[PDB]
Swiss-Prot record, chains A, E:
Disulfide bonds: none annotated. The chain holds residues 332 to 567 of 2179 of the full protein. This is Capsid protein VP3. The lineage of its organism: Viruses, Riboviria, Orthornavirae, Pisuviricota, Pisoniviricetes. Interacts with capsid protein VP0 and capsid protein VP1 to form heterotrimeric protomers. Five protomers subsequently associate to form pentamers which serve as building blocks for the capsid. Interacts with capsid protein VP4 in the mature capsid. Interacts with protein 2C; this interaction may be important for virion morphogenesis. It is found in: Virion; Host cytoplasm. Forms an icosahedral capsid of pseudo T=3 symmetry with capsid proteins VP2 and VP3. The capsid is 300 Angstroms in diameter, composed of 60 copies of each capsid protein and enclosing the viral positive strand RNA genome. It comes from the Viruses.
Curated annotation (Swiss-Prot), chains B, G:
Myristoylation is required during RNA encapsidation and formation of the mature virus particle. Interacts with capsid protein VP1 and capsid protein VP3. Lies on the inner surface of the capsid shell. After binding to the host receptor, the capsid undergoes conformational changes. Capsid protein VP4 is released, Capsid protein VP1 N-terminus is externalized, and together, they shape a pore in the host membrane through which the viral genome is translocated into the host cell cytoplasm. It is found in: Virion. This is Capsid protein VP4. It comes from Human rhinovirus 14.
UniProtKB/Swiss-Prot annotation, chain D:
It is found in: Virion; Host cytoplasm. The chain holds residues 77 to 331 of 2179 of the full protein. This is Capsid protein VP2. Signal peptide: none annotated. It comes from Human rhinovirus 14 (HRV-14). The lineage of its organism: Viruses, Riboviria, Orthornavirae, Pisuviricota, Pisoniviricetes. Interacts with capsid protein VP1 and capsid protein VP3 in the mature capsid. Forms an icosahedral capsid of pseudo T=3 symmetry with capsid proteins VP2 and VP3. The capsid is 300 Angstroms in diameter, composed of 60 copies of each capsid protein and enclosing the viral positive strand RNA genome.
Length: 236, 40, 273, 255, 236, 59, 40
């Protein structure tokens, strides 16, 4: 008999431990693997795919319309939209990025924010997207927004503009859960010139906004999400 | 060291360390170069 | 591994930030493509976001109950909870379900941990040392009818015997009939106008019966059984939209009627920060 | 002078051209292929009709109006009555196939509108009744007509709320699936090549729909002053690398 | 003392575990082995031996007659017998194949179904055996059966016809316990021409049917069978 | 038609043995070309020699 | 590694990996070739 001394923790069940255990089905031969396209190895792989942002929260219920960012003709200087950058809440909470991000406590890296114009081909416009890094308020006019990271977007043949929100922070990681010290800043869009519609054309044109992560992205400290729950066990 | 005869009883696999987002991010037929006009 | 390269001023015909999302592609645009950057390193591998790690921890997948009490005069042991069973499935408790449903097909080995805890709601002179028997009853195996059937002989079915208050642990190889488990199934068991729809017809894994081996004591003991599941040697295919609305049933994608909006509504403008 | 916009697809004796495309999507970057020996289980020699089934079939056109919610088709269901492909579907116990989906919708440089064209593997629909109600066979086998998301619920049928993808997930995240947009100002066609995706080598083509195709208006249709407030949408699908196995009597399916 | 930490599962008795244990009879020398013919190594070995199928269930009790498939003279087109292919139930349930198959949850592979003619030597007949793979109903007439896998059997010198039921399935394994999604199809037999009896010969001739597995066969996930039980422990 | 107009037509060739198609679905089942009207003004559809006998009468 | 002195105390043997059904399937005196008439 090999002399041993059991240590504290013996008999405990740590849901996170990774040990060996006897197989209840010895000699069982599992089914052969066959090729299946679309294999996923890391969640960081899929958050690089962008999905639509319900930037237009404003409605009384979930609607296709919450994804449509309204643009108005012949408006100058004015603001198109705005939002803080707590990717684990607000407009981002239901996106694929926000959804996956909420399975972790910490995040870091650069975000990829895109805008696709859907107005008529014969219309034109120049908008300006701006990222205001933490430390100051969300910009209240174009001049203020323009002083920080921004992109002047000329609408045309190439329908989409991709503005990056470069990782701008002192501490190397932020909490996915909205935390002040760890705030990411603000995102806003303004009319650089203005939206011009062609003759016989009337009303509203919309912008579609997307969000995804850059290969920059890091996510850590896995945890349960606030995006799902139940009161009783489900039954068949 | 593995104490059991079956593969199913061994512990976790360890990082796949493959990581190729392109099959989801760029599943296009004609390769698109960053910087080149998306629609030529 | 560099996180960002050094990149300076720019004035080109090459516009990396102008794309066409209608192509269906997400061009890999980087910060160095739209601003002047300095060199930084990743110092990160992404270990914790590997599917092996994501589904690689134990999650409670079922809670059930059995009890030790005089069986004399009980006509339906099953109903009396003299023994109980669980129609094996991983979509009853929502936390693990949402994770698994992040993919369409999933393949892995399973590590189970069964925790049994005792309870004596009314007058008892002591807590008894009960032994639980968990037996796997695959489709086609005879189901127990009485807490002390011949079925508990378990000559071919695998089963564990462990103390209440203690834990049971063992792993199971990937037992799917196909090359991978289906998290979703847009089909039926056959071309019939009334037959069931969804993975309900695919995930027919039999069930596992639980019972307390000891005969009854003067008092009654309530034993609660919790089953935990940990996936290992994971493979996942076809990522999908995460679940947004609450679940209503095991296996179906059904969501409740008159459900509340899941997308937050702004306390103000679309211009609000 | 070759462009991402101009394309030709020839399958069998059918050809498609488009002068306003936006490249083309190949699901998970994988072109369809036949079933290799190493993955096969069924021992029957399979039948490969080739060009007689691997050709473009054009479904009935849909009408996009200012109030359209979207449409949903299922494969192979949508082609269950298309020439020799359909026949083979019911005469065989098993089958496997890939497809080239081509959605069409033209307007003018004065119109505006944006359709999301996406392919969803194993699109298990939800019952509008909630609870544990099922969705009867007929309702997930609309055939060529497809499911109209703006139509009313019906007993035994699926929920049709565009916002929840008919399955409890949000519309905005449908982009994680191979998709393409038809943005009238840029586009007029969407093309998606679908490889066989399943957890089994081959399968029943009547009791299981491998994927469903959805055409969903995101940015609503807008027509110029006094113009017809509608636009037609046409869906053309061609099976590819189609294999059939276990020939026999010919199924008789619900309704 | 070597420091150790006991893990969850300690003290458990998994009937399926395969460990070492001290011998209660140290130094005991077991009896020498002698050669004994008929050694069995794998159950897959014996299921390849075919046994009689009680295809003619129809009786009020178990009888030699349940193994006799009646054949009638001067009948054209008509059906001789039929059965679904749930090898773990129905006619197959009591056969060696069905019996062994029920000790496992999953099965896959090809089945070997045979028919031996026992009518007089001077009689003749041509029958057709058909296998209808899943997806359609059991054939209701020869034409329908003939459209699927089949064998036209000419009765003669060689008394037995061996028709194989080739593994025809999408999923690579089926449940031994009757399950719809996992159904194997149908088996039927019809008169290709008809049974002709010679002069001075009268009545019924019978067919004997056999079932066995091809080397194709796979069986997995061991389990208890529904073919045996008891209410009380047996005594001497 | 005007440059700013648009259209998609489908030309179909129905080889001998069946009638002239009576609707698009029927025509579409045979040799055809889906023509997208645009910059290139002309579509060229070939009527491939589809016959058993190797020659036909002009009459 | 075996901890005990007696053979009986060791764990399971591991797949025989012999497998010869012929002693049960073809216990005939004169070899019968598949395809050749069973009764010549
Ligand atoms: C999806 C999906 C994947 C799975 C795998 C279920 C595994 O099923 C089991 C379980 C839960 C337990 C045992 C088991 N073997 O021994 C015991 C005992 F200890 F519980 F008896 N349980 C065997 C199988 C095949 O179920 N749904």
């Amino acid at each position: 008999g090999l002399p041993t001394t059991t240590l504290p923790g013996s008999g405990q069940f740590l849901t996170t431990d990774d040990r060996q255990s006897p197989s209840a089905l010895p000699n069982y031969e599992p089914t052969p693997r066959i090729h299946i396209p679309g294999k996923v190895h890391n969640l960081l792989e899929i958050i690089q795919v962008d999905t639509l942002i319900p930037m237009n929260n404003t409605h009384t219920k979930d609607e296709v319309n919450s994804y449509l960012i309204p643009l108005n003709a012949n408006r100058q200087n004015e603001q198109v939209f705005g939002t803080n950058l707590f990717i684990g809440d607000g407009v981002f909470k239901t996106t694929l990025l926000g959804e996956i991000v909420q399975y972790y406590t910490h995040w870091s890296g650069s975000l990829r924010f895109s805008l696709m114009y859907t107005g008529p081909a014969l219309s034109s416009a120049k908008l300006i997207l701006a990222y205001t890094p933490p430390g100051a308020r969300g910009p209240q006019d174009r001049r203020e927004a323009m002083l920080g990271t921004h992109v002047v977007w000329d609408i045309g043949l190439q329908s989409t503009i991709v503005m990056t929100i470069p990782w701008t922070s002192g501490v190397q990681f932020r909490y996915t859960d909205p935390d002040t010290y760890t705030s990411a800043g603000f995102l806003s869009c303004w009319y650089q010139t203005s939206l011009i519609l062609p003759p016989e054309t009337t009303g509203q044109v919309y912008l579609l906004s997307f969000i995804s992560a850059c290969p920059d992205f890091k996510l850590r400290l896995m945890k349960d999400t606030q995006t799902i729950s139940q009161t009783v066990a489900l039954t068949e | 060291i593995n104490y059991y005869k079956d593969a199913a009883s061994t512990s976790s696999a360890g990082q796949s360390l493959s990581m190729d987002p392109s099959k989801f991010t760029e599943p296009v037929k004609d390769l698109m170069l960053k910087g080149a006009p998306a629609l030529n | 591994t560099v996180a960002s390269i050094s990149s300076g001023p720019k004035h080109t015909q090459k516009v990396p930030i102008l794309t066409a999302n209608e192509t269906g592609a997400t061009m890999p645009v980087l910060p160095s493509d739209s601003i002047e950057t300095r060199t930084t390193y990743m110092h990160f591998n992404g270990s914790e976001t590997d599917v092996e790690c994501f589904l690689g921890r134990a999650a409670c997948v079922h809670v059930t109950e059995i009890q030790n009490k005089d069986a004399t005069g009980i006509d339906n042991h099953r109903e009396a909870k003299l023994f109980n069973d669980w129609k094996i499935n991983l979509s009853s408790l929502v936390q693990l379900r949402k994770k698994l449903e992040l993919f369409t097909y999933v393949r892995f080995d399973s590590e189970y941990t069964i925790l049994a805890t005792a309870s004596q709601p009314d007058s008892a002179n002591y807590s008894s040392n009960l032994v639980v028997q968990a037996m796997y009853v695959p489709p086609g195996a005879p189901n127990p009818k009485e807490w002390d059937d011949y079925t508990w002989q378990s000559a071919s079915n695998p089963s564990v015997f462990f103390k209440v208050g203690d834990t049971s642990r063992f792993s199971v190889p990937y037992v799917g009939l196909a090359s991978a488990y289906n998290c979703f199934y847009d089909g039926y068991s056959h071309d019939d106008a009334e037959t069931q729809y969804g993975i309900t017809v695919l995930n027919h894994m039999g069930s596992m019966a639980f019972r307390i081996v000891n005969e009854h004591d003067e008092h009654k003991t309530l034993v609660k059984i919790r089953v935990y599941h940990r996936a290992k040697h994971v493979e996942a295919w076809i990522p999908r939209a995460p679940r947004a609305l609450p679940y209503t049933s095991i296996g179906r994608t059904n969501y409740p009627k008159n459900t509340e909006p899941v997308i937050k509504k702004r306390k103000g403008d679309i211009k609000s920060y | 002078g070759y462009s991402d916009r101009v394309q030709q697809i020839t399958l069998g004796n059918s050809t498609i051209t488009t002068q306003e495309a936006a490249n083309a999507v190949v699901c998970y970057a994988e072109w369809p292929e036949y079933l290799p020996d190493v993955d096969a289980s069924d021992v029957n020699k399979t039948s490969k009709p080739d060009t007689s089934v691997c050709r473009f079939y054009t479904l009935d056109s849909k009408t996009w109006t200012t109030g359209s919610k979207g449409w949903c088709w299922k494969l192979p269901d949508a082609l269950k009555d298309m020439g020799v492909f359909g026949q083979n579907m019911f005469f065989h116990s098993l089958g496997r196939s890939g497809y080239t989906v081509h959605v069409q919708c033209n307007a003018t440089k004065f119109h505006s509108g944006c359709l999301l064209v996406v392919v969803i593997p194993e699109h298990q629909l939800a019952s509008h009744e909630g609870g544990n109600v099922s969705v009867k066979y007929t309702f997930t086998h609309p055939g060529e007509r497809g499911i109209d998301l703006s139509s009313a619920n019906e007993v035994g049928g699926p929920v049709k709320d565009v916002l929840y993808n008919m399955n409890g997930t949000l519309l905005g995240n449908l982009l994680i699936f191979p998709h393409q947009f038809i943005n009238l100002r840029t586009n007029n066609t969407a093309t998606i090549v679908i490889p066989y995706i399943n957890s089994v080598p081959i399968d029943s083509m009547t009791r299981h729909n491998n994927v469903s195709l959805m055409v969903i208006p995101i940015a609503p249709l807008t027509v110029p002053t006094g113009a017809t407030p509608s636009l037609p949408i046409t869906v053309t699908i061609a099976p590819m690398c189609t294999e059939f196995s276990g020939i026999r009597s010919k199924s008789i399916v619900p309704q």
